[PDB]
Amino acid sequence: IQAEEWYFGKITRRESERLLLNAENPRGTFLVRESETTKGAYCLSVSDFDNAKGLNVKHYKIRKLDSGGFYITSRTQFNSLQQLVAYYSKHADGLCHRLTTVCP
Amino acid sequence: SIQAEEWYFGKITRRESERLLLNAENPRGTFLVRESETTKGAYCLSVSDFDNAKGLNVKHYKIRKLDSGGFYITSRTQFNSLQQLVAYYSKHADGLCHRLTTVCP
């Protein structure tokens, strides 16, 4: 996974908001990094825009089932992280926006 | 002028540096210096490394600028230029994952 373009490893929540919040990035720009807060979990950080708050980043915890798979909600589970990224690029399913560009 | 240094890569992102450095053709210790995207005014030394478990990986060390003039990564040694910092760590790792060997192509 270290060689996945979208995996940024151990950056913090505040580093990921600085990397993403760029007023020249499309809505849905994202990255996957490790959760600082929950050992063993990952986190999908996604840039969003709404009228009021403007540009902001949403963070979604990704948990790993002990049998192996990954999930953000009870709707779908994925046998790998790349399957999760691939799925949410085509279907937002509760996320603020489908995933569009990897963080530059 | 640092703009023209072989090892200086300006404003490339954290992601681009890793894309440059994670490559089978690079020795452990391949590096580049760039601006930090996350801390303005700071630079960053990115270094390719290899460990048996994770294979090829990149480590990133922030380089802080003393307002008085120097540059540092640790309290052990400070430097008056980035050329000096790059030269020193090419001779001694001193906490880095590996001595700097190859300038990133």
**Domains assigned to chain A:** 1-104 (3.30.505.10)
Q: Which residues of A touch B13 (CB under 8 A)?
A: 19, 104
How distant is the Cα of A16 from the closest Cα of chain B, in angstroms? Answer: 9
Please, are residues A48 and A29 in contact by the beta-carbon 8 Å criterion? no
A99 touches chain B (CB under 8 A): no
> Which has the closest alpha carbon to A85: A42, A32, A17?
A32
Helices (H), A1-104: 13-20, 81-90
The pair of three-digit structure tokens given for residue A4, joined into one six-digit string: 């996945």
Distance CA B12, CA B99 (A): 22
List the beta strands (DSSP E) in chain B. Answer: 31-35, 43-51, 55-65, 71-72
DSSP string spanning A9-61?
A: ET--HHHHHHHH--TTS-TT-EEEEE-SSSTT-EEEEEEEEETTTEEEEEEEE
The span from the CA of A37 to the CA of A81, in Å, is: 19
How far apart are the C-alpha atoms of A101 and B73, rounded to whole Å?
33
Give the residue from A75, A78, A81, A70 showing the smallest Cα distance to A95. Answer: A75
Integer Cα distance of B42 and B40 in angstroms: 5
**What's the token pair of residue B91?**
């001779």
Which residue's structure tokens are 């709707």? A75
CA distance A95 to A72: 9
d(CA A81, CA A64): 9
CA distance B62 to B77: 14
> Which residues, in sequence order, are CB contacts of B80 under 8 Å at separation 6+?
B69, B70, B71
Q: CA-based diameter of chain B, in Å?
A: 42
Q: Which of B15, B22, B49 best tests the A interface by mutation, with the highest count of A CBs <10 A?
A: B15
Q: Does B11 touch chain A (CB under 8 A)?
A: no
**Stated length of chain A:** 104
How close does chain A come to B35, measured CA to CA in Å? 13
The shortest CB-CB distance from B15 to any of A2, A18, A104 is to A104
How close B13 comes to chain A (CA, Å)? Answer: 7
The alpha carbon of A64 is separated from its chain's Cα centroid by a whole number of angstroms, namely: 14
Q: What token pair was written down for A91?
A: 């279907």
Resolution (Å units):
2.2
Write the Ramachandran bin of A9: left for phi over 0, alpha for psi from -120 to 50, otherwise beta. left
Q: Do A8 and B14 touch (CB under 8 A)?
A: yes
For the record, the structure tokens of A9 come out as: 């490893």
For residue A93, give every residue at least 6 positions away whose Cβ sits within 8 Å of its Cβ, in sequence order, or none: A73, A75, A76
Contact A46, A60 (CB under 8 A): yes
Tokens 């708050």 map to which residue? A53
Contact predicate B62/B35, CB 8 Å: no
